[PDB]
Amino acid sequence: QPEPDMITIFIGTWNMGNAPPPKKITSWFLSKGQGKTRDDSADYIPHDIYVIGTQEDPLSEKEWLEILKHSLQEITSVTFKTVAIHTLWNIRIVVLAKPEHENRISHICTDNVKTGIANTLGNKGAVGVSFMFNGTSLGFVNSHLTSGSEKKLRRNQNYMNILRFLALGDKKLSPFNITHRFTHLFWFGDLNYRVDLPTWEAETIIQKIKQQQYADLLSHDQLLTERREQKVFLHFEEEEITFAPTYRFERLTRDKYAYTKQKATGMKYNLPSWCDRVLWKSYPLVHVVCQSYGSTSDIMTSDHSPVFATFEAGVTSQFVSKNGPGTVDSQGQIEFLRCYATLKTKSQTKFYLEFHSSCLESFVKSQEGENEEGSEGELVVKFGETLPKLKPIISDPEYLLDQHILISIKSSDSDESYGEGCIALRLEATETQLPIYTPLTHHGELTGHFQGEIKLQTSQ
Ligand SMILES: O=C(c1c(F)cccc1F)N1CCCCCC1
Numbered sequence: 001q002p003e004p005d006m007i008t009i010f011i012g013t014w015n016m017g018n019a020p021p022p023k024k025i026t027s028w029f030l031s032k033g034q035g036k037t038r039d040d041s042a043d044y045i046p047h048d049i050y051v052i053g054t055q056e057d058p059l060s061e062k063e064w065l066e067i068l069k070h071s072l073q074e075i076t077s078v079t080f081k082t083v084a085i086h087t088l089w090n091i092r093i094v095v096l097a098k099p100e101h102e103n104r105i106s107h108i109c110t111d112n113v114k115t116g117i118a119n120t121l122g123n124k125g126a127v128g129v130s131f132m133f134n135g136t137s138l139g140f141v142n143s144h145l146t147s148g149s150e151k152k153l154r155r156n157q158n159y160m161n162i163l164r165f166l167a168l169g170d171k172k173l174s175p176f177n178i179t180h181r182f183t184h185l186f187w188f189g190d191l192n193y194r195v196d197l198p199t200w201e202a203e204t205i206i207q208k209i210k211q212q213q214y215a216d217l218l219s220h221d222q223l224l225t226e227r228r229e230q231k232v233f234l235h236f237e238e239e240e241i242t243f244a245p246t247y248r249f250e251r252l253t254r255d256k257y258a259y260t261k262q263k264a265t266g267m268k269y270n271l272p273s274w275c276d277r278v279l280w281k282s283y284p285l286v287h288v289v290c291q292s293y294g295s296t297s298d299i300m301t302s303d304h305s306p307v308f309a310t311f312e313a314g315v316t317s318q319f320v321s322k323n324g325p326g327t328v329d330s331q332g333q334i335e336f337l338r339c340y341a342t343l344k345t346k347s348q349t350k351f352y353l354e355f356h357s358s359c360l361e362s363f364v365k366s367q368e369g370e371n372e373e374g375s376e377g378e379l380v381v382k383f384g385e386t387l388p389k390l391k392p393i394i395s396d397p398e399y400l401l402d403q404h405i406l407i408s409i410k411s412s413d414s415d416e417s418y419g420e421g422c423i424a425l426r427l428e429a430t431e432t433q434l435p436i437y438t439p440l441t442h443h444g445e446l447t448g449h450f451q452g453e454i455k456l457q458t459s460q
Contacts, residue, residue, distance in 0.1 A: 003104075003134055003317040006287065007048035011278045011309045013142065015055040015190040017251070017302035018090070021067060026075055027296045028306045035243030035294025038310065046076040047310065048101060049083075051129070052094040053142030055190040056302075061085050061092070068094055084129045088112035091189075093127045093142045107132045111167045115158040120146070124158060126189070130168035130182065135316035135358075135402075139168050139182035143189040148268055152222045155192055156232040163444045172363070173356055175408035175417040179235070179444050183404075184282045184313050187236065190304070193223035194273040195245065202259045205272050209244050209257070217245070221274055234444060236279040239293035239309065245272035246295050246305040254300055278309035283404045284438075285426040287314030316402050324393025328361065331459040332395030334405065334425070336387040337433055339452030341369065341409045341440065343379045343418055350412040351381045359392040359403040359425075368412055381409065383452070397458035401426055407450055409440065419447040423454070430456050 012028055031038035052068060072080050080096035083105055114125040126143035143162055146154040169181030195217050208217055218224060218241060226232045248270040250256040261267045282288040292310040299306050323329040353366040366388055369381035392400055403425045408417045419440025427434050433453045440448040
């Protein structure tokens, strides 16, 4: 029975509005409704992994697991295994997988982050799950961010707190936040970003939605505009939105958007908005293709419609050779040539690098670089040909070319990371000097760049 090199992943996000679901929710898991929908010919084909994020979820874990499992069994005739379930207040994540995957999944982690302080602490935040699927690390984040059209900056702050403090994946990757710990990271939820148009334009917006003309609305979506301005979700992807705004509906129909200010809304307008979103970030040159992104039309218990997204995702096998794991394979090596970091910092400490990768027995510390002044004010840290030769555990190119090197640039004075990035070993050539590049981030914000050349030796 061969190990897969692709799997499909279903991501769902639904703010349930504190109401129990209707008796049938299969359209959600089938990616049927509005937007980029799944072909009918695939309806019986199970996804490998289903990740369900809910917000304002009024059900117990037991109650929701029974609904989800019975739903998938009705669709696929497969009894899914529960990988993980984690709940913070009324924010929940469930991960289900095909039974054939049970012995491919390991290192299961869960965590949550509570956002805000005092007033603003008590219902918003995030839950997450991570695990290994054979040689591939997968992370999943369900966040319910701050509500309200005039709180986009708070949402951005909530995002930075979640990626800083959510403790998922390999704790040995100590310089790295969740935006670097996984081969594939999916971040979804009621992100609560709104269409920023005047309140007076409510009926005009509704008209546009009825005509399926979303362009003049999406050009004012706060998540797209904040992302364009590099204020949030830097280096994440989102599929194009081709479904109607998923909030705020009158319950028990989808024929009406309920946007007017009411005591129940704190006298706030809720113009139709794409609150409910799925984004992802995968390591460079790993296969990931969105195959659906849309909303259901027939699930109407909440003032939000459920959102679905599905992905093809590249996975690798748990590789064994005669040598590694448990030793190096002297036929393998990674050399960095003519490397330099460009940093936005005003600091004047010396810096060193750390190289982290599951192709190494443990992380590798470099010597300190040579600081120079850049022509436009910047710090340039030069490593020359000084960087340590990295010794991978396995030299087979079928393994090594699929790996990645995480890089942290750390202050010698404080040992704190000033920037993190990732280099793919999926090179055009081996035994050949080739350009490499990564942006560097810290707390998910841009702090610099790392560039130079690489020379990879495999056993072939
Ligand atoms: O499509 C992108 C995009 C891009 F154009 C280049 C690189 C990475 C990206 F994610 N974004 C969505 C539209 C708004 C702009 C922000 C990001």
